[PDB]
Design an enzyme around this catalytic site. Sequence first.
Site, PDB file in Angstrom:
ATOM      1  N   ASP A   1      44.636  38.713  42.513  1.00 32.20           N
ATOM      2  CA  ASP A   1      43.232  39.048  42.315  1.00 32.20           C
ATOM      3  C   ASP A   1      42.834  40.378  42.915  1.00 32.20           C
ATOM      4  OD1 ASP A   1      43.064  36.551  41.187  1.00 32.20           O
ATOM      5  OD2 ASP A   1      41.470  35.831  42.522  1.00 32.20           O
TER       6      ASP A   1
ATOM      7  N   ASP B   1      38.564  42.930  39.451  1.00 32.28           N
ATOM      8  CA  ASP B   1      39.587  42.135  40.134  1.00 32.28           C
ATOM      9  C   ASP B   1      40.877  42.640  39.496  1.00 32.28           C
ATOM     10  OD1 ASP B   1      37.595  40.675  41.371  1.00 32.28           O
ATOM     11  OD2 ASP B   1      38.441  38.726  40.866  1.00 32.28           O
TER      12      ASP B   1
ATOM     13  N   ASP C   1      45.300  36.690  32.988  1.00 34.32           N
ATOM     14  CA  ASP C   1      46.567  35.962  33.027  1.00 34.32           C
ATOM     15  C   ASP C   1      46.608  34.488  32.648  1.00 34.32           C
ATOM     16  OD1 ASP C   1      45.216  35.873  35.484  1.00 34.32           O
ATOM     17  OD2 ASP C   1      47.004  36.092  36.687  1.00 34.32           O
TER      18      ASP C   1
ATOM     19  N   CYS D   1      48.981  33.932  39.590  1.00 31.98           N
ATOM     20  CA  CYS D   1      47.844  34.192  40.445  1.00 31.98           C
ATOM     21  C   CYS D   1      48.225  34.148  41.924  1.00 31.98           C
ATOM     22  CB  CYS D   1      46.748  33.168  40.179  1.00 31.98           C
ATOM     23  SG  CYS D   1      45.812  33.451  38.674  1.00 31.98           S
TER      24      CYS D   1
END
EC number: 2.1.4.1
Lengths: 360, 360
Positions: A107, A191, A242, A344
């Site tokens: 992020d 982000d 993603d 992530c």
Amino acid sequence: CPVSSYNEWDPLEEVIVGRAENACVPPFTIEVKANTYEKYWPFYQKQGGHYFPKDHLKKAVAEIEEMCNILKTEGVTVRRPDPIDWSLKYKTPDFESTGLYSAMPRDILIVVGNEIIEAPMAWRSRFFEYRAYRSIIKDYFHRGAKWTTAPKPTMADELYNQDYPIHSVEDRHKLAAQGKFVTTEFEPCFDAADFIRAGRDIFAQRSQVTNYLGIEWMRRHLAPDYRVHIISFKDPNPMHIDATFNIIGPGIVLSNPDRPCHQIDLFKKAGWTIITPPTPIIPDDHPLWMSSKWLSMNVLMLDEKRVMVDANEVPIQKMFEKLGITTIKVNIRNANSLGGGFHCWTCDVRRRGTLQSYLD
Amino acid sequence: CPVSSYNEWDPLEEVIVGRAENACVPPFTIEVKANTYEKYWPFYQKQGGHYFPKDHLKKAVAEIEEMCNILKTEGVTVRRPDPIDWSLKYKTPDFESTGLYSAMPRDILIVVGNEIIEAPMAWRSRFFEYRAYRSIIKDYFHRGAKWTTAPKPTMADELYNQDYPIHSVEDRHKLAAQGKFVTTEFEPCFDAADFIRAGRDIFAQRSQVTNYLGIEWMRRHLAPDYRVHIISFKDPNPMHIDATFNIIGPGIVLSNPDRPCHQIDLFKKAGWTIITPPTPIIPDDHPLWMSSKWLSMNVLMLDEKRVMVDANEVPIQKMFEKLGITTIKVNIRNANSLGGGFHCWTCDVRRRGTLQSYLD
Ligand SMILES: NCCC[C@H](N)C(=O)O
Ligand SMILES: NCCC[C@H](N)C(=O)O
């Protein structure tokens, strides 16, 4: 040259894996509400500012330690951010807030070549998230890596569309069609996870947390070596790309069936293979406070033929298997509650390979 | 292309001029004490956190308005930072503090080509100083300029040498010889004013507020187009280079007689003219809370043959006059108390000229 990664699939050599420790429910401000499913509003309304359920955090800690063990087994060097208490209340001249976590390196950090870029963020509870990663980044810097921090926003009221139809309305789709979200174009913000790399071409999505100014900053900062392209999808609440368009190999991309790309023909004309994964099988009773069920396609590629995938999601495992991709199954069911899958929870720092073009 | 400046002397076209409004005495922490003359310790010990004497600030406001009128008369476009109350107390997870001012654009912004760079700073009371300049910078950004913010430090205790012999000791010279000051090498930090531009060559000084990591960040960020060289001088308390080595034309530099350069031969071999200005004549009874009397050589060049110089400093006026440089005399005696002369109170955004080499 510890840092060197041009895409999402070359042979992985070093990765930063997030921490679930001390994660805190973010204060229920306009931008948070814009991301939260009606179902969890009460949880946020009551838990804002406190730690996420510790019994749950303990299970996530366990799952991520195992994931790290597997990465080491697979030959990957793992680095972790520093432990920090995210409950500390801070105050800038523009606002006051408590933090979130350092669970998702994706992020906030993105690696383009030999350069590590710290995204500015768009959420007030994530203003100081970069503090958990400075020990790692300074080490890479001392070892020769380039280090860039995009302009940190003020995050004053002017950045948020105070009267966004968050409450439920779906014509969010309408504003979404207009490139209009909860964040205005007051100042740059984004982000890192709204960008996904394919060598000389990086694709970005204007989302709830990434505005056009933020994308323009990236485009201008990275030109002329890299071209940053903007793409959009059918999504009333975009945040990160993603779990929507995950590029898994040179010319191969996983496209979420619920979020079709308005520019899919750009990719078909390039001779790219668009694979639509099967639906997630995660139980509806399991809490996903920060995202959708689509974390199943949030896979991380160890290399072109090795993918780290969720142990419980058998349907997508079979999909990779029919494609000749070895599935490395790890269970991160509880870590999913924090908001992300394998892609992530990591940030690929070094992948063996060179800068190439895959769009021709 | 509003932004374009490669040196300190090409024909000036646009400049940002600071504001004296709401300036606050910074809390007397280790780094501030390292910069303060024993004579003012009581003032800082009693006034920390409050506005500088308002009767004095009013006189400074007047002087700078006049300076701005003169700049407009001379054909220069003037932009000013936003007015802000510097007394607001802020809190990061690492420290708490009140602000200083936005009087010195030179301390925080530096223009290298078409790129505006916001320095990270090293003082806790200057952590949020960039907020006063964001309106201007975003405008230039919208108009095509590059915008970079160097990595913002945490400014945690580890950045400051808690046991620096501030109290008076002069062997500060000794540590100074060792490249050792009040700021450690914990993380990158610097004030833009420790860099002075000469086209393809920028000279930097490791000072109380600028460490080697900060200089290395700049060197690495600007290479290969620009070469950042480090130079040192005989100074027990360095902070900013423009009242020590002020470059006034292609191959012409004003070298403070009290602060000789250890690398002066690099310049003599280049065929550069080193002029040592005569002593300042400012009364010792006039308060200079943030600097030395050497603000007299802190001139700003409108062009190679036009210099904005202090009205009261006749000796240096005659010096420029014998050199064929037209002196534009402005009185900023009270503005000097805040810490700077003309070069400190401005930031040249656009100067008519091209990127050249002057070191051969
Ligand atoms: N970190 C990726 C999350 C993706 C997206 N917000 C989703 O809910 O699918
Ligand atoms: N802004 C320039 C100040 C220069 C130096 N600290 C001095 O006291 O001369």
